[PDB]
Design a protein around this ligand. Structure first.
Ligand SMILES: [Ca+2]
Ligand SMILES: [Ca+2]
Ligand SMILES: [Ca+2]
Ligand SMILES: [Ca+2]
Ligand SMILES: [Ca+2]
Ligand SMILES: [Ca+2]
Lengths: 217, 217
């Protein structure tokens, strides 16, 4: 006989259900000669938040009761129990782990709308200027939460239309052209764009912020 | 002992892994007195597409080896096998279903960039004119593939800047104002927008097309 294994139960967040929705049905094969009742415990069940996951005490059917939000809780570790009439467990508790599958339901947001940095005159190419980054509430290990950066605009456009670059993963802005001269421009304004889905422009979500770089003496 | 039918296993499309990624560990309880080898069969394993799901022949650990795409294959039906070293079946094959969970990785697309329709002069409010629609490659039963429409603009702006409306669920363009007069204007140009996630404005994906409506005599 194959040995009972519960797989990870992966549920997408923001389910429309309808609810309750069946997940797994467990039972003890000791029920052939003993009378059992089943229960679930843990955060999601009997610990806060309570009642997201419930089990039918007679059938051992496990269910979800409402939509989930990975951004509140991404993982539930439940334990299911089989007990006799004395109230004693007749099986080792079984682990039921629930992973909430991430949806891309969060746009990138910048901590500040305006970021200030400076860079000295005559700085050589590759000179570090500043870091601007955004945050995406989605899962950083999924595409939904993986951010890429770029410069959409630089003003003014002299002596070179691309005085800077930004590291697409880290948000480090470094100079790439020479000719930084306070007598000619004292402040460059860059528009920074963050977009998720690893910067995919066609199905990624994006946002923008601005970086003001002062050229110092 | 616990007893439980393995439920369908849900995996998100476009997983970043890393790979290989463990899904379940299956085993026969006959391995306590026999030395067993495990295997998987079905499209996704040993049939095309090949090598997506693999099992360790000694441990019975099942794994994914690469990202999935709901838009290519949405479901895998696998069978897992237990044999002794003589090559003899020691268990009935077990069915393993894998559901590929839909991500919003597809932008709405209109069938045409330009849609042509007409409406007669002096048509009363509520006159159906035409239907313009888009398609979304994602699951039409999830938010990712559920579309809403709206009118972004109307040109020219007379006699009213809103001569029409569009059914948000359906793409049906209907007149809502009177004063349709070919002598004064023969054509209105509308920009129509489709956006998914049921038209969610902060994280829904959008696209546009134009409707040219001719006023007939
Ligand atoms: Ca969420
Ligand atoms: Ca999310
Ligand atoms: Ca996101
Ligand atoms: Ca896809
Ligand atoms: Ca999809
Ligand atoms: Ca979509």
């Amino acid at each position: 006989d194959w040995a009972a294994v519960i797989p990870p139960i992966n549920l997408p967040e923001n389910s429309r259900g309808p609810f309750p929705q069946e997940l797994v049905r467990i039972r003890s094969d000791r029920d052939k000669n003993l009378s059992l009742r089943y229960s679930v415990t843990g955060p999601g069940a009997d610990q806060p938040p309570t009642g997201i996951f419930i089990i039918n005490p007679i059938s051992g059917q496990l269910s979800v009761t409402k939509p989930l939000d990975r951004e509140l809780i991404a993982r539930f570790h439940l334990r299911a129990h089989a007990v006799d009439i004395n109230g004693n467990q007749v099986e080792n508790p079984i682990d039921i782990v629930i992973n909430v599958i991430d949806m891309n339901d969060n746009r990138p947001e910048f901590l500040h709308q305006v970021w200030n940095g400076s860079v000295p005159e005559g700085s050589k190419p590759g000179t570090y200027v500043m870091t601007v980054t955004a945050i995406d509430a989605d899962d950083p290990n999924a595409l939904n939460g993986m951010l890429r950066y770029r410069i959409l605009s630089q003003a003014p456009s002299t002596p070179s239309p691309n005085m800077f670059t930004i590291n697409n993963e880290t948000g480090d802005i470094i100079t790439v052209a020479a000719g930084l001269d306070r007598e000619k421009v004292q402040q460059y304004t860059l528009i920074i764009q963050a977009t998720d889905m690893e910067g995919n422009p066609t199905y990624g979500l994006s946002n923008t912020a601005t970086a003001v770089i002062t050229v110092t003496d």
